């Protein structure tokens, strides 16, 4: 009888997370444009 | 993460992976290979 | 005692009588793929041979 080693695996609740890239943006951005012609 | 195929509470092997073939009677000893506890 | 490690098959062998012929004593042979039959059949040929 060849001796072996075992592990007794059991059920347990696991979570699954994902790493994703990405950039940040302004919530409410507004560049001004002059709407009129002068100096 | 085993999707489907392996039962809960069902023992698998860690030591002696070269020493056995399917169809050979073995003995069970708690393996000191897995680093968890 | 090396059969009680239960993880890795350990063989301890002495070097031969004259050292420059090899590293382990006894015969040795090659099993060629002369017909171009392939690795997936030469592997099971060696597993059949052992």
UniProtKB/Swiss-Prot annotation, chain B:
Domain of life: Bacteria
Protein induction: By growth under severe iron limitation.
Disulphide bridges: none
Phenotype reported upon loss of the gene: Disruption of MexA, MexB and OprM significantly reduces active efflux of N-(3-oxododecanoyl) homoserine lactone/3-oxo-C12-HSL/PAI-1, but not N-butyryl homoserine lactone/C4-HSL/PAI-2.
Subcellular localization: Cell inner membrane
Assembly and interaction partners: Component of the MexAB-OprM multidrug efflux complex, composed of six MexA subunits forming a hexameric tube, binding to a MexB trimer, which interact with the trimeric OprM outer membrane channel protein. OprM is thought to not directly contact MexB; instead, MexA joins MexB and OprM by forming a funnel-like hexamer anchored to the inner membrane. MexA may initially form a hexameric ring complex with MexB prior to OprM, then OprM undergoes a conformational change as it contacts MexA, allowing the periplasmic gate to open.
Function: The periplasmic linker component of the MexAB-OprM efflux system that confers multidrug resistance. Functions as the major efflux pump for n-hexane and p-xylene efflux. Has been shown in one study to be involved in the active efflux of the autoinducer N-(3-oxododecanoyl) homoserine lactone, thereby playing an indirect role in quorum-sensing; but has been shown in another study not to be involved in efflux of this autoinducer. Over-expression of the pump increases antibiotic and solvent efflux capacities. Implicated in the secretion of the siderophore pyoverdine.
Similarity-based family: Belongs to the membrane fusion protein (MFP) (TC 8.A.1) family.
Extra information: In both X-ray crystal structures approximately the last 100 residues are not ordered.
Protein name: Multidrug resistance protein MexA
Organism: Pseudomonas aeruginosa (strain ATCC 15692 / DSM 22644 / CIP 104116 / JCM 14847 / LMG 12228 / 1C / PRS 101 / PAO1)
Gene name tied to this protein: mexA
Range within the parent protein: 333 to 369 of 383
Curated annotation (Swiss-Prot), chain C:
KO phenotype (gene knockout): Disruption of MexA, MexB and OprM significantly reduces active efflux of N-(3-oxododecanoyl) homoserine lactone/3-oxo-C12-HSL/PAI-1, but not N-butyryl homoserine lactone/C4-HSL/PAI-2.
Induction comment from the UniProt entry of this chain: By growth under severe iron limitation.
Role, per record: The inner membrane transporter component of the MexAB-OprM efflux system that confers multidrug resistance. Functions as the major efflux pump for n-hexane and p-xylene efflux. Has been shown in one study to be involved in the active efflux of the autoinducer N-(3-oxododecanoyl) homoserine lactone, thereby playing an indirect role in quorum-sensing; but has been shown in another study not to be involved in efflux of this autoinducer. Over-expression of the pump increases antibiotic and solvent efflux capacities. Implicated in the secretion of the siderophore pyoverdine.
Family membership: Belongs to the resistance-nodulation-cell division (RND) (TC 2.A.6) family.
Quaternary state and interactors: Component of the MexAB-OprM multidrug efflux complex, composed of six MexA subunits forming a hexameric tube, binding to a MexB trimer, which interact with the trimeric OprM outer membrane channel protein. OprM is thought to not directly contact MexB; instead, MexA joins MexB and OprM by forming a funnel-like hexamer anchored to the inner membrane. MexA may initially form a hexameric ring complex with MexB prior to OprM, then OprM undergoes a conformational change as it contacts MexA, allowing the periplasmic gate to open.
Remarks, miscellaneous: Pyridopyrimidine derivatives, such as ABI-PP, are not exported by the MexAB-OprM efflux pump, bind tightly to a MexB hydrophobic pocket and so potentiate the activities of antibiotics such as erythromycin.
UniProt protein name: Multidrug resistance protein MexB
Organism for this UniProt entry: Pseudomonas aeruginosa (strain ATCC 15692 / DSM 22644 / CIP 104116 / JCM 14847 / LMG 12228 / 1C / PRS 101 / PAO1)
Biological classification of the source: Bacteria, Pseudomonadati, Pseudomonadota, Gammaproteobacteria, Pseudomonadales
């Amino acid at each position: 009888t060849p001796e072996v080693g075992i592990v007794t695996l059991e059920a347990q609740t696991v979570t699954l997370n994902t790493e994703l890239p990405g950039r940040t943006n302004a919530f409410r951005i507004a560049e001004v444009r002059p709407q009129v012609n002068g100096i | 993460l085993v999707t489907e195929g392996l039962n809960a509470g069902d023992k698998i092997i860690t030591e002696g992976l070269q020493f056995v073939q399917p169809g050979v009677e073995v003995k069970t000893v708690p393996a000191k290979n897995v680093a968890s506890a | 005692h090396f059969f009680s490690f239960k993880d890795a098959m350990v063989f301890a062998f002495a070097p031969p009588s004259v050292l420059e012929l090899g590293n382990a004593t006894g015969f040795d042979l090659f099993l060629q793929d002369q017909a171009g039959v392939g690795h997936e059949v030469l592997l099971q040929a060696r597993n059949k041979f052992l």
